[PDB]
Amino acid sequence: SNAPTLGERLDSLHEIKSARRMDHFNDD
Amino acid sequence: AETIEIIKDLFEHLCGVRVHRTYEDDTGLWFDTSQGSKNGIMDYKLGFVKSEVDTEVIYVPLLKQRTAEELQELQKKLPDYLFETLSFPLRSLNQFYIKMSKSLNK
């Protein structure tokens, strides 16, 4: 869609690397 | 075009959702979002990432954009995990949007 900046490209990779996996959001 | 594009386009028109900046890079399709009404507003970035291909959603809370008082209010209302960067499967995006919307309204 739009061309990414340096910061955006860095941010994407940092955020993928540091993300914590959660399977779902629900309360019992 | 891509399923991801379709999902994004619908996500931007959800009730209470305001999408500001959008970009696509090698990792996938990303956009900055503001969600919530008068009660509380949360800014975050979603990434729809494809990397035999894998698809996931990345959630990035944007806390720098809040005042200290706004962050204090949000921390009472939302679960701890919404103040960290998360990954989750696309099939949980609906659960995520509902949780965020209800937490902000509390």
Side-chain angles (χ1 to χ4, degrees), chain A residues 1-27, chain B residues 1 3-37 39-49 53-106:
Chain A
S1 68
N2 305 341
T5 66
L6 276 172
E8 282 172 341
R9 288 168 78 188
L10 277 168
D11 290 351
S12 296
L13 299 163
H14 171 246
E15 293 149 4
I16 293 169
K17 188 172 75 67
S18 69
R20 165 150 83 82
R21 179 77 164 186
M22 282 190 68
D23 193 84
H24 49 264
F25 319 79
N26 269 322
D27 290 0
Chain B
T3 300
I4 274 169
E5 222 158 81
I6 296 167
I7 294 215
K8 171 222 160 187
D9 285 355
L10 303 184
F11 192 87
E12 65 184 356
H13 292 99
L14 286 174
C15 287
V17 160
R18 306 172 284 285
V19 176
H20 300 301
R21 161 69 179 169
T22 307
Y23 67 90
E24 189 169 359
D25 69 6
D26 275 11
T27 69
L29 171 64
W30 297 76
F31 50 95
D32 273 9
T33 312
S34 176
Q35 190 175 339
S37 60
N39 314 61
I41 291 176
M42 181 73 188
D43 284 278
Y44 58 91
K45 185 181 174 185
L46 287 187
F48 294 99
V49 172
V53 214
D54 277 7
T55 182
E56 74 180 341
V57 184
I58 306 298
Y59 160 86
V60 185
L62 303 172
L63 313 181
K64 270 174 152 45
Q65 293 186 31
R66 300 272 67 82
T67 66
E69 171 164 44
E70 294 165 354
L71 187 56
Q72 294 188 229
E73 290 290 334
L74 288 170
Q75 286 187 298
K76 293 180 206 173
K77 295 203 274 187
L78 317 191
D80 290 353
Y81 55 75
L82 291 182
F83 299 95
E84 39 189 327
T85 298
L86 305 176
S87 168
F88 52 85
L90 210 55
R91 49 174 165 92
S92 292
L93 182 61
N94 186 233
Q95 297 175 43
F96 161 83
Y97 165 79
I98 294 173
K99 175 60 79 169
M100 179 73 74
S101 189
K102 286 185 178 172
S103 302
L104 296 166
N105 276 338
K106 263 180 182 188

